[PDB]
Amino acid sequence: NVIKMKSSDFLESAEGKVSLAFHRTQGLMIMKTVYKGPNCIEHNEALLEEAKMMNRLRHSRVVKLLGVIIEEGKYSLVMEYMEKGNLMHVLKAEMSTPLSVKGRIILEIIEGMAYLHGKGVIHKDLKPENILVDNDFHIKIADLGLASFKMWSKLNTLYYMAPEHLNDVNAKPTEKSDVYSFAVVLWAIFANKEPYENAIAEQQLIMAIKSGNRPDVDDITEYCPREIISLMKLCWEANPEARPTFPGIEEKFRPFYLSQLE
Ligand SMILES: CC(C)(C)C(=O)N1CCC[C@H]1c1cccc(F)c1
Fold first, then answer.
1. 8 A C-beta contact, residue 47 and residue 65
2. Which of 38, 165, 192, 217 is most exposed, with minimal Cβ within 10 Å?
3. Is 62 a known ligand-binding residue?
4. Are 129 and 194 in contact (CB under 8 A)?
């Protein structure tokens, strides 16, 4: 379960320094080059160690780590390609998407999160830019800011942040941290836009969220079923002990999806 790769396995293209790369043997991939600079092999013991723990993450709704590049002067993570881009990009394209496709995207996000909390991984940065979409509108979850991987992150969006982490950085994130973020993602999916569009200042704004202000449920111009609006209000309750587990979300939403939108 060692997956090292050489820089010269790959013909690049431009899109951290994310790059569209053809591996000469296995094909089209995405390459996050996290560092091009002086050899600094002081850390490789650790960067290979983090890469080991993310190779452990294999699920149809998570982005797969297909290989790493550790070479003197260039360090890269290589991910699978996702044709259509991130979730916001899709939601904002002109040909908008039926309620029932939005239904599945939600269920698939629910699935991927239940897998990650099963592995003890707290995502810590769930938001539409980390949700990637292929040609058939299937999503995979990614952690592009490297929020679970301190070593890679060091080398290298308050909208979705649970409030107990707003103006408190030392609080350890919990599963309920991500459930709040899922709540605002539900909102963005039906609003087809980022929340808090009309906000004065991010210091003003943070104080508003802590005091229980949320994104505008009226601002949802598409139809959004009642029970999904109630779900998102339930998932963004100020008290983390009052939000459900992702296992608990699924046990409510999968029946609702099967019997109302699929
Ligand atoms: C871009 C990388 C490779 C870091 C990426 O998104 N990874 C790698 C393995 C699985 C996946 C992932 C998804 C969600 C949360 C998380 F912490 C990690």
1. no
2. 38
3. no
4. no
- What is the rounded distance in angstroms from the CA atom of residue 126 to the CA atom of residue 185? 8
Alpha-carbon radius of gyration of the chain:
19
Q: Which strands form 74-80's sheet, in the order they lie side by side? A: 10-11, 17-23, 27-36, 74-80, 65-71
Q: Does any ligand 1 atom lie closer than 6 A to the CB of residue 121? A: yes
Ligand 1 centroid–CA 63 distance in Å is: 6
Q: Considering the candidates 9, 125, 143, 216, report the single residue annotated as catalytic.
A: 125
- Taking CA atoms only, the protein residue closest to ligand 1 atom 4 is 143
Distances (CA, A) of 110 to 103, 139, 146, 203, 260: 11, 11, 21, 31, 17
Q: Which domains does the chain have, with CATH numbers?
A: 1-81 (3.30.200.20), 82-262 (1.10.510.10)
Put the strands of the sheet holding 131-133 in their side by side order.
85-86, 131-133, 139-141
Strands 27-36 and 17-23: antiparallel
What is the rounded CA–CA span in Å between residue 77 and residue 69? Answer: 6
**Declared resolution, Å:** 2.8
Ligand 1 atom 8 nearest Cα? 65
Best mutation site among 1, 63, 69 for ligand 1 pocket (most ligand atoms within 8 Å of CB): 63
Nearest CA to ligand 1 atom 12: 142
Q: Does residue 178 have an active-site annotation?
A: no
Looking from the CA of residue 77, the nearest atom of ligand 1 is 3
30's tokens: 């995405």
Q: What one-character DSSP code corresponds to residue 260?
A: H
